[PDB]
Structures are given as structure tokens and as C-alpha cells.
Amino acid sequence: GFPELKNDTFLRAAWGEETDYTPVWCMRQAGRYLPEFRETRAAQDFFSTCRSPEACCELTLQPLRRFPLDAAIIFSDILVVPQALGMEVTMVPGKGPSFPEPLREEQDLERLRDPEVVASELGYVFQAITLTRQRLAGRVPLIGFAGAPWTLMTYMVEGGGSSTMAQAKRWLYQRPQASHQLLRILTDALVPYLVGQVVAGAQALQLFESHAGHLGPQLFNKLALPYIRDVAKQVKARLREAGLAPVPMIIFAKDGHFALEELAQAGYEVVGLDWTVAPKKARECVGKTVTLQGNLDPCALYASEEEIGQLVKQMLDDFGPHRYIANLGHGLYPDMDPEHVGAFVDAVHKHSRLLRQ
């Protein structure tokens, strides 16, 4: 009972179909780089301006008012899941995302909620999605999302960010059983959560495995990959059993060059790439079946509009017009110029058409 989709270029490319042009969207398009974002966000604290459907909806719609993006992604935070599981967050302006009381001992798992009840705790997200889907009025598709099991585990154990993930990785080596247990709890919670996002109106899903790079091939296939595979499999199964049409799923493994091959067989229609992997080599690794979502160095936007167009042109030339969705290699940075984001979007549209005509 939602508006009929007008521009579905993003969805067609995601499924591997040919399109008149290359669709484009930016991770964190609804971000601090937009003056309007800080003002709206300054209404209250993080988990209040995130808990308000209308607020999340507005934040989601803001970038679309500035740029002809080919998709919108619901505004939320990957930390909503750990929170919904019973972990307290103290979002401060300086540090940012933080768990003042991180998991450290296997015993610390007892304080988490039964993953089965997490979906009911995230009702506000579902409401924001339905609302955003209604307000978008079929302009472009709406992407739902969540953090991958390993990445969420790193936040829960590290308590926040880290350049080494030493505490989280220590868990994998010293506490492999407890690590598997935590990773399973995270999977059992993400599935019903992601399914709920589709039920509420999400037309695609992206799983962010942002801390994939801290692991090597062996650990990754051992503790991260299995759950990345379980999420896609189970989400697809529940959607079919519920009578709903599965949506295209994207797996983003930042710094995951070493796992591109495994990921292309993980059950996701799209594989997101960071800027360190050359497009052509990525294509080799993933094959010719999956769609690659892709990688301009976000910092590249610091260059002039002219330089951006050229860098975009070269990026498209490497990826080729088939099975490709343009994007940045990572989320946008707070000090980036909105006008340069516009140039990126425009450049992708202009060149992708030339690369076809």
C-alpha cells in the first residue's frame, strides 16, 4: 500500500539489469556535511532525534532535496541493535558512539536481551521507514540497513572505535566459543530486524561490515563470513514465507579486499567496495554475476569540481556500464562541501550516459 516507484534504476542495476545510466547514492548522504542536518539533529540528543519517525524521515529526505540521488537510505545508526539488546549508549559530542560498560567477560553476555525481542524494541525505526517510504512518494527506492555481526561485536567489546580491535580480536582468539555465541545472538536479532525494515517498506538492504579489515582471511572466514551468510539466507527465507518479495541485499566489507571472492558467493546481489581496491581487480575477484557498488575515495571530494568529474570518469571507465552502482568508498566526511557532492552525483550521471551513447 505504498506509492508506486517512479525511478527504479537503482533496483534494476542491483539485480544486474542494464540501465540507461549508472545510478548513484552516497553512504552517509544524510550527514553532518549538510548544514540542515546539524540543525535538525540539534533538536535533542542522538537517541531522541533518531527515535522520532518524523525526524529520521526529514534527515533521510534532506540530501534528496539537494541532489538527484537514485536512492535514499533510512537515517539511523548501526548501534541501535546493540542498544536494543540491552546495552547503554552515552553519545557525547566529542567521542561520539560509546558504550561506557562494554562486554569483556563471557558472563557479560547474560545482560543481553533474547534476540527474538529486539525487533519489538526497534519499532520506531520501522515507523520512520514507512513514513519515509510514504513521503518519498515513489521518487526513488528506500534502502534499509544494519551493521554486520562482527562489526557490531567490535563496538560492543571495544566500547566504541579502535585502530586495532585488539579487545574484540582477543575475544576471537581467547574466547572463540563466547565469540560464536555473541555473533549468533547478533545474527538472530539482525534477521527479524532487517525483515521488519522490508515489512515497513524498505526496498533494498545493506549490511555494513565496516570493521572487516582488522581481520585477516582466516579469521574472517571463520567468524565473520558464516554470519554474513546466515543473515542473507535467513532474511530471504522469512520474506518469502511472509509472502513478501525479497529485496536486493548489499554487503559492504570495508578493507575487505581479501574476501571479495567469498563475499560474491555469500548470497548478496551487490558487493560494496572501499576505495583501495582497483575496480578491475574487484571485478576479477567477484566474477561476472554480482553487482559491484562503488568506491570513489570520499576524500576525493576535496578536489575541485573539475577534478572530481575526471576522477569519476576514470572510475566509471574501470567499472564498465554493466552490473554497477556508483557510490563512495566510504561514508561522507563532516567537513565536505555539499556542492562537491553535487558534482560527484552529476558527474556519474553525465559520464555513464556518454559511456553508453
Next chain:
Amino acid sequence: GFPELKNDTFLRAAWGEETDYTPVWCMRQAGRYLPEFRETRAAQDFFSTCRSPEACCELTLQPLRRFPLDAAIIFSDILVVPQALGMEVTMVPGKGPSFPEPLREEQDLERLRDPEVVASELGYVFQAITLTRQRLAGRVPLIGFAGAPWTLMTYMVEGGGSSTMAQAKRWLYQRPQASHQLLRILTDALVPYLVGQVVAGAQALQLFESHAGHLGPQLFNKLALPYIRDVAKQVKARLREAGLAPVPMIIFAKDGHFALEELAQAGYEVVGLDWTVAPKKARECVGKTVTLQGNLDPCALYASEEEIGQLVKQMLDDFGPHRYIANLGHGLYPDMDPEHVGAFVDAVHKHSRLLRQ
């Protein structure tokens, strides 16, 4: 006029020669994980217990008293070069390495010293090297080192660590000229510095390009690679002109999977790898000429001694007995157990011999 080298396994492997066993050493073997290291270091501040030849010598020798490592690396800090160039460091216990006044404008380059005078400012390092070479009495080779131009630039612009290198990378995109200028100043200072380390007695050299991963292939070949190439070329040339025998040079580019091919042709005898690159794929990328220095996940040492031996066995099996020097994928972490470091060393020696016999 130094003692004759008794065990040269490290040097032979570095040059590509066959050895009875695989030589092994650890980045940061002289590190906080050793109780004796903190005590000696607690004599005074960082740049005082580093400015004392006898102190640096003792720190260098400490790990060798515990483990039969096949090489020793002079104890120092990559930040000594920027400091010697005129930048003030305020080493605090919490943050660590820091420049309270980082370079931000092109004008900020004017306060740096003429790179030609940097060598004379680092005399204390040379003294510590000669002293350590004398005291080692030819037991094993002594490795000298420095940070690569880009990596040093990131510290000078960022003022310290960063998970994105946004300020440094902004320089590359917005200030490519000034970036090239700074990178050249850093090259012109490193060459005479590295040559001086050999003159003082260093029998090998390692260039740490620790922040290689923040750049992508394009930027890397554009701003990092050229200087990595200049260092090796110029150091070799000056050593020959001085009548000295060039030493084997190692290039370590952490998270530099994308540049393994270029690096193997950069003029270095050895290419250091981080733990994310599979040994076999690294071998493919580098070829069959260069020696690979290599990669156990430092965090792997959190596992039991038994598990470490197995992980070491598998690592050796992948690298093969030819052209290989065992090491960790990165420096040791402060909370690691000395006994587990011993097990790593022992495992490499035991298995490498079995892999031959």
C-alpha cells in the same frame, strides 16, 4: 672495525639465498610488552631515554636476552626525523606521539630545517647504533630504520594518529604542490639519515610506510611510491660512492596489498607484509625475485602456545622455504605475553627446519 658476524641467516635470506632455517624477528621486539622495557624507559621522558646511546642500546638488546631472534633492530622512533626537521613533540603517556603544532598551511613548511642538516641532528642515533653493533659482538645483524616519506608526512600534518588521515589526504588533493615539496624535504632528509645509520654500523634497513593503506592505488603511485623509490636508489648510490657495501633494504607498507606489485620493483630486497594479505597471493603479486618478510597477525599471540605453533606451521607452509623472513604482520602489542613471543620464535625455527628436512 666491528665484530665479525656469527649468525647471518637473516642477511642471506634477505638477499634471496637458501638457509638452513627461516630467520625470525619481531617489529617492536623492544617494546612495552617486556617489563624490563618499561623500567628502563621510565628513566626519563621519551626523548631522553631515546637520546641516550647506552639506553637505546640496552633496549635493543633486551629482547635478544629472552629470545634467539635472528636479528636486532635499533630502538628509536620514526618521529625523530620530523623532530630533527624542527617540529616540537610533546610525548604524553595517554596520547603518545604528538605534535601540538602540526603543519596545516603551505607556509608552515618554512619552519622546517634544511634537510641536509638533519643527519647532524640525529648523531645520538648513530652513536647508539655503533654502540649496539659493538655490544652485540656479531651475534646477529643489526637493522636500522626510518619512516617512509608519506607516513612521516601524515604525522606532521595530522599531529599524531588518525583513522582516516583526512587532513593529510586533504593536502594531497588540495595542495598537491606543497605535498610534493614536503615529501621531497622528507626524502632529502631520510637518505643522509639512513646512510648514516649504515656508516654507524647498521647491516640492513627498513622503511616503515605504516600509513600506506589510507591511500588508494592512484594516490599511492602518485605521491607515496615515487619517494619510496627515491630513498632506496639514493641510499644505495651514496653508500657505494662512500666505498661502503650496500645493505639489504626492506619496505613495509602496512595495508598496502594494492601496491605489492609496484613495491617489488621499487628497489628493495625485501617486502614486508601485513597479516591481511594471504602469503601465496603476496608471492604472486611480488613475483619470484624479492624476499617476503612475514605476516603473522600479532594478535595471534593471544592464542595458546600450542595454537601459535600451529598457526606458525601453516604460515610457513604457505610462504615456502625460499626467499622468506618470518615476522609479525605488525609491531607487538603492549599487553602481549613474553612467553608467547618466545613460542612464536621457537615455532618458526622448529617448523622451518622440518619444512626442509
